[PDB]
Amino acid sequence: PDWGYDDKNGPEQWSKLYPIANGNNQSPVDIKTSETKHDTSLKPISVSYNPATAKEIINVGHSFHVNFEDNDNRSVLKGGPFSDSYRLFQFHFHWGSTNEHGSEHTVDGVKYSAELHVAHWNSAKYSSLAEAASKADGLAVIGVLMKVGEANPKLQKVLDALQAIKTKGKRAPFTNFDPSTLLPSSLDFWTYPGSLTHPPLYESVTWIICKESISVSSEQLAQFRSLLSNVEGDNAVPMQHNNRPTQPLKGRTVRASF
Ligand SMILES: CCOC(=O)CCc1ccc(S(N)(=O)=O)cc1
Ligand SMILES: [Zn+2]
């Protein structure tokens, strides 16, 4: 690809190939709690995922993705600021070189070790992810900040699957898994209109950021960074980091459900 996270093809240079990178609805962002606007119009978040929709895990070079079958509404997200039902299709993570950083969103300037993203597309208005991907109200992503600490047992199945997709392009069946089990006990959240955090960077994401974080150990994070960005046979190139710096809010208002 013509983009990555290196010095030459990293976030700082993405605007040269993708001008929208300097847009008005870019993500992630720093959430300043003193400036958040509590909205009583926000309903609780509701997630109902069917473990049978889990499909495959893929090493995409810069990260790894766990995709789900999205032919129907067996797995959906509702409530919050949505009136329409959003269909789950994937979840993945972002992390940094060291524990000091790794998350994409930040709260009051505080950076966490990694971040979990659970993505969905508007199947109420659109017919496919491809169509919805570029629509202002096309995507919905739940972001969960991961604070380094005790090992998180709920990450086990995912972590155990990485040894099968070590190098770029590798992919394997990943089934019978319900990602709602990775979410924090409380679903209080913040929401704002944003975008994909990496190319194509479409400003089509309604973000749902959980107030409560989930844990992850230094060793578990080591496993993410142990993934390789090269194709099998070439010299190993560890996947050290894949988080984008926070972007300018530019007038946007972050709403709180609590
Ligand atoms: C199976 C096809 O998968 C996709 O097209 C995923 C697109 C995609 C969804 C969400 C995000 S993020 N970082 O903004 O949460 C990035 C890229
Ligand atoms: Zn992401």
CA distance linking residue 163 with residue 223, whole number of Å: 9
- Going by DSSP bridges, is the β-strand pair 64-68/86-95 parallel, antiparallel, or unpaired? antiparallel
Within 8 A by CB and 6+ apart from 3, the residues are 9, 14, 17, 18, 198, 199
Task: Look up residue 208 and give its amino acid.
Answer: I
Tokens of 98: 């060291």
Q: Is the CB of 196 under 6 A from ligand 1?
A: yes
CA distance linking residue 173 with residue 241, whole number of Å: 25
Q: Is the CB of 119 under 6 A from ligand 1?
A: yes
Nearest to 14 by CA among 249, 245, 250, 241: 245
- For 208, counting Cβ atoms within 10 Å of its Cβ (0-12 exposed, 13-18 middle, 19+ buried), the class is buried
Q: Are the CB atoms for 25 and 254 separated by under 8 Å?
A: no
Q: Atom 4 of ligand 1 has which residue's CA nearest to it?
A: 90
Nearest to 243 by CA among 115, 57, 86: 115
Secondary structure letter of residue 106 according to DSSP = E
Nearest to 203 by CA among 25, 16, 17: 25
Binding-site entries for substrate: 197-198
Binding-site entries: 62, 65, 92, 94, 117, 197-198
- The single residue listed with the structure tokens 């789900």 is 68
Residues in the chain, overall count: 258
Within 8 A by CB and 6+ apart from 146, the residues are 93, 102, 103, 112, 113, 114, 115, 116, 152, 213, 214, 215, 216
Exposure of 133 in the CB half-sphere (CA atoms within 13 A): 12
**Does the annotation count 62 as an active-site position?**
yes
CA distance linking residue 176 with residue 230, whole number of Å: 29
Closest ligand 1 atom to 195 CA: 14
CA distance linking residue 90 with residue 23, whole number of Å: 25
Domain boundaries, the chain: 1-258
Q: Resolution of this PDB entry, in A?
A: 1.9
Q: Atom 8 of ligand 1 has which residue's CA nearest to it?
A: 196
69 CA → ligand 1 middle, Å: 15
Tokens of 31: 């959430």
Q: Are the CB atoms for 102 and 251 separated by under 8 Å?
A: no
Q: Is the CB of 117 under 6 A from ligand 1?
A: yes
Tokens of 9: 């093809």
Q: Is the CB of 141 under 6 A from ligand 1?
A: yes
Task: Look up residue 198 and give its amino acid.
Answer: H
Q: Atom 6 of ligand 1 has which residue's CA nearest to it?
A: 90
Map residue 172 onto helix, strand or coil: strand
CATH number, domain 1-258: 3.10.200.10
